[PDB]
Design a protein around this ligand. Structure first.
Ligand SMILES: Nc1nc2c(ncn2[C@@H]2O[C@H](COP(=O)(O)OP(=O)(O)O)[C@@H](O)[C@H]2O)c(=O)[nH]1
Ligand SMILES: Nc1nc2c(ncn2[C@@H]2O[C@H](COP(=O)(O)OP(=O)(O)O)[C@@H](O)[C@H]2O)c(=O)[nH]1
Lengths: 339, 339
């Protein structure tokens, strides 16, 4: 629920104070103890924010059809199966039919970019509350490429590793390196960049998607044993919904009763079985973020010090401006204060 | 045959031509119409060459082992099966137990590296003679990585990049861009770092790999028909042995077999498998070298240039040893003049 402080903040911020108000960008930054999820194209980010949401909602692209930021805030709810989700985009309105919030996304995206990729680097706040998922805060970054293909441009190349390394440079968001597993990890565009900033591992968890489709006479152990690309935390093995199934329409729900069936009932990791899977990770993520948020709230006094550099310190273009620039930091306190 | 000469030549240069003369070692480089196999760690490189040689012979590369620019030469022999292979590493001696070759390759490497992955840059002149090969000259090449793993210092990564880029830069050199089907080509460290040196896509040929290891769902109808990531030439895709196979020590000869009926009996691909086989890469390359050379061989004045720049060289450590360049440079042109 604390994870939802950041969110109860956060939004009410890119609600107005997404300007960068001389010194009112100083929040969606520190305030962003919130995992960033990176994965070079075809990695699997697109999917794991669907089995960590146990519901569709992303416009599917095994190449790329998601070319934006994306602040995904979750929230458990009192077992009263009122699912739904909102948007800062569309104010005070509610969705239900996820498969058409997977068109709204596909549509806000299209209000600048295209059918085959352009440039747009300003967030997309969507909060999903759902009885059967974990209180948390994600931010989707688009896949990481090195070959400028089609009627794309040729900065797309170093313009995505731009975007990425600057939602990553921020010493607050935790890195989440999705690196599929029919390729070596000594090749992770993810890990390569995950190590660029944070050679320390202080923020950074391994994901490693796709294994059912990994080789034969190979398997996945020495990472979830943590012996090859040993990570400061551990690694977390997932099985998402194969291409095989996304076309077969497969629900998200009985999808997880499938990845379950996997490691519990597949010789090779029948023993690692319990620290693996969508359902799990989250429980973990949320846990390792809460610590983070928590252990980082005397961003009060460091919150509570950028107020009087205003409130008690006053053509008139910035007086027509500090009329926004403050409400934020004040809406801030109470939103903490309270609980 | 026109090829076999190039081989027959370079063995001679860098048989004493590895320290050059500060203005006449563009001559292995010069004499380099030859294919360089340029793929990223674990791509397929190795497993492919064994498929171009019908035999085993290779240090196994999931945990890499060939980090010596192995200049692999092949030559054809009339249908009397004196199969035999011979090194420069050791003048006049011949081989048979192929693993005894594979043992030697990985016995020299160890002299110039370690066992937990290190670096050096002299070549390796392992040559092979057989009915079942087409005349070729590869220089195999270190696998393009992007994460210094474990005991590799760090400068390791971007030090392989400039080594792979080196053979490659040379305008008479070909490129074997090996890249596996189970990852969106827009993350081919290969295609990326090919199109680097060769924006003309003129001396690059395509190579899919691991296609049985693709996902029940997707396939490659699109790249082989050359309608997705087209080159200039057709894209040949193949099925070397999988870990799986290397374990039951799947007799090499059982290679080509395997895939043929794969490629033949597969619907998706069916109609292509005559322009597709492993065997038919060699053929298709060895025929493409021919032209390459008969094109360039007026790089016969690249010589009469240095033999003109030294014939007129008009303690005694150079002189007496300049002529041991000419007579081992010059009469190469007479060995070219010849045919
Ligand atoms: N079978 C299987 N397929 C996967 C897995 N992860 C990703 N894929 C497939 O990869 C393709 C798209 O990956 P995507 O979710 O879009 O990741 P992204 O391309 O990096 O955004 C689809 O075929 C996915 O089903 C997995 O764990 N198992
Ligand atoms: N099934 C299958 N497996 C492959 C293919 N190519 C490579 N492999 C496997 O991929 C792994 C690495 O291949 P390898 O040749 O050693 O990579 P490289 O030598 O660094 O290019 C090994 O386990 C191989 O058995 C292929 O075309 N099909």
């Amino acid at each position: 629920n604390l994870i939802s402080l950041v969110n109860k903040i956060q939004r009410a911020c890119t609600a107005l104070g997404d300007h960068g108000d001389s010194s009112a960008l100083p929040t969606l930054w520190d305030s962003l103890p919130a995992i960033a999820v990176v994965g070079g194209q075809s990695s699997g980010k697109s999917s794991v924010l669907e089995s960590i949401v146990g519901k569709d909602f992303l416009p599917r692209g095994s190449g790329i059809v998601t070319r934006r930021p994306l602040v995904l805030q979750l929230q458990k709810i009192d077992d009263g199966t009122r699912e739904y989700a909102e948007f800062l985009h569309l104010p005070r309105k509610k969705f239900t039919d996820f498969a058409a919030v997977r068109k709204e996304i596909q549509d806000e995206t299209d209000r600048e970019t295209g059918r085959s990729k352009a440039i747009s680097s300003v967030p997309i706040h969507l909060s999903i509350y759902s009885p059967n998922v974990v209180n948390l805060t994600l931010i989707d970054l688009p896949g990481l490429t090195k070959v400028a293909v089609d009627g794309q441009s040729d900065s797309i190349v170093k313009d995505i590793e731009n975007m990425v390394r600057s939602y990553i440079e921020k010493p607050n968001c935790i890195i989440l390196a999705i690196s599929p597993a029919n390729q070596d990890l000594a090749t992770s565009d993810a890990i390569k960049i995950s190590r660029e900033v944070d050679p320390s591992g202080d923020r950074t968890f391994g994901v490693l998607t796709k294994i059912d489709l990994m080789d034969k006479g190979t398997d996945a152990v020495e990472i979830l044993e943590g012996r090859s690309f040993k990570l400061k935390y551990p690694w977390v093995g997932v099985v998402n919904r194969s291409q095989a199934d996304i076309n077969k329409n497969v629900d998200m729900i009985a999808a997880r009763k499938r990845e379950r069936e996997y490691f519990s009932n597949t010789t090779e990791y029948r023993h690692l079985a319990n620290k693996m899977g969508s359902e799990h990770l989250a429980k973990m993520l949320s846990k390792h973020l809460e610590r983070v948020i928590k252990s980082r709230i005397p961003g009060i006094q460091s919150l509570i010090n950028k107020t009087v550099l205003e409130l008690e310190t006053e053509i008139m273009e910035r007086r027509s401006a500090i009329s926004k620039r403050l409400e934020l930091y004040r809406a801030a306190q109470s939103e903490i204060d309270a609980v």
